[PDB]
Write a protein that binds this ligand. Structure first.
Ligand SMILES: N[C@@H](CCC(=O)N[C@@H](CS)C(=O)NCC(=O)O)C(=O)O
Ligand SMILES: N[C@@H](CCC(=O)N[C@@H](CS)C(=O)NCC(=O)O)C(=O)O
Lengths: 218, 219
């Protein structure tokens, strides 16, 4: 059976958990503790990090038979290929590639603010309307970002949007179609059942040493 | 009508795309935007057209090809890679190219950080390289290309990142003979070689005008 290793956080692992839940893929989650401040010790992870067979040790990792993967996007694409969640046509694939990279940039910008520079918060929330407009416009009246077909990048998008809503609950207010997107994803029957299940991880979004985690406790 | 690659007059993250287009012989206008002098480093021109190109996520680089309009460097690379037979085929090749694309992307950001804003930490950065390059060395092994027997778009990424890193520290590949062999193999392909002897080929600047590494080295 497959093993998913990560912190006990959402961060950039959640879109993977969401894919696994949507597909009814049984998996084993391996977490690693982070100690209390100020050292935030990670000895357990460090004790095994180079002993797992991974070409480039990191979190999250995915161990599936003799398939051993790091890089969260490499893992989403891997699962995508096994469960019909890749783009199909050339027009679909340029949409999914582009937005995968754009969401990655956004998620990094979110991490920058939420971990070490949470004093830049009101500036970060001020730049979101312009960013979200670009997604709003890109999605248009499509049910999913690639068009008619649900793809792995909808999982990434939903989760990043949802995390930003935790940071700023009004950030989707000006964009009806983006609000309709979150609801569409949440209403997928397999998503709705996963999110009601015992393994669903609601908190925390970031790790314990992120300022966002320390101040808001989400 | 036929394709426009838009970027600064630098190598940075757009050169691996230039290396792909060159290898495939595809004709493209490269459209450039200027950057003003210190202290302003003006970008009025680019900023004047940036939102008027019909790009979904306006940015540099971009690639315009008929009604196809693309931003995100890796997205452009993957698009060229599907077009020209430079994707992996095997399940094992695809999991290898995905991982290394993403790994090189991280590595490249770490390099940009040090060369643009934190060039004071350069000795610490160079000292960090061996452990990272060791990972790339072992990953590659005796294969001629990172995906296996087959040349893919992520060799175009790996060669340029390693070459930029050689411009930073001439000694960085020294303990890794397969990696050094890789730079020359890529350099030895005939589409590559002629592209490099072409006048349009960019050797410098690696980074933009306002990078500390550029101000100091002038490469
Ligand atoms: N580009 C990587 C970033 C992975 C990453 O930064 N993981 C963090 C947690 S979000 C980490 O703890 N990395 C290093 C480590 O665990 O040793 C990916 O997408 O997977
Ligand atoms: N993740 C993006 C990064 C794009 C990017 O950072 N572009 C820089 C130059 S390296 C830029 O000047 N963009 C133009 C802008 O901000 O308007 C990619 O891989 O293309």
């Amino acid at each position: 059976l497959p093993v998913l290793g990560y912190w006990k956080t959402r961060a950039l692992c959640q879109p993977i958990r969401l894919m696994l839940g949507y597909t009814g893929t049984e998996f084993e989650e391996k977490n690693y503790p982070v100690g209390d401040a100020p050292d935030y010790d990670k000895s357990e992870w460090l004790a095994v990090k180079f002993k797992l067979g991974l070409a480039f040790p990191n979190l999250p990792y995915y161990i599936d038979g003799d398939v051993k993967i790091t890089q969260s996007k490499a893992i989403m694409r891997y699962l995508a290929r096994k469960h019909g969640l890749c783009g199909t046509t050339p027009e679909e694939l340029v949409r999914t590639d582009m937005i995968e990279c754009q969401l990655t940039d956004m998620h990094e910008a979110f991490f920058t603010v939420t971990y070490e520079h949470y004093e830049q918060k009101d500036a970060y929330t001020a730049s979101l309307p312009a960013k979200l407009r670009q997604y709003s416009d890109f999605l248009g009246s499509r049910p999913w970002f690639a068009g008619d077909k649900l793809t792995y990048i909808d999982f990434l998008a939903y989760e990043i949007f949802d995390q930003h809503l935790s940071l700023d609950r009004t950030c989707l207010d000006g964009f009806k179609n983006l609000q309709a997107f979150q609801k569409r994803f949440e209403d997928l029957e397999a998503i709705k059942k996963y999110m009601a299940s015992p393994k669903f991880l609601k908190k925390p979004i970031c790790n314990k040493y992120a300022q966002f985690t320390i101040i808001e406790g989400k």
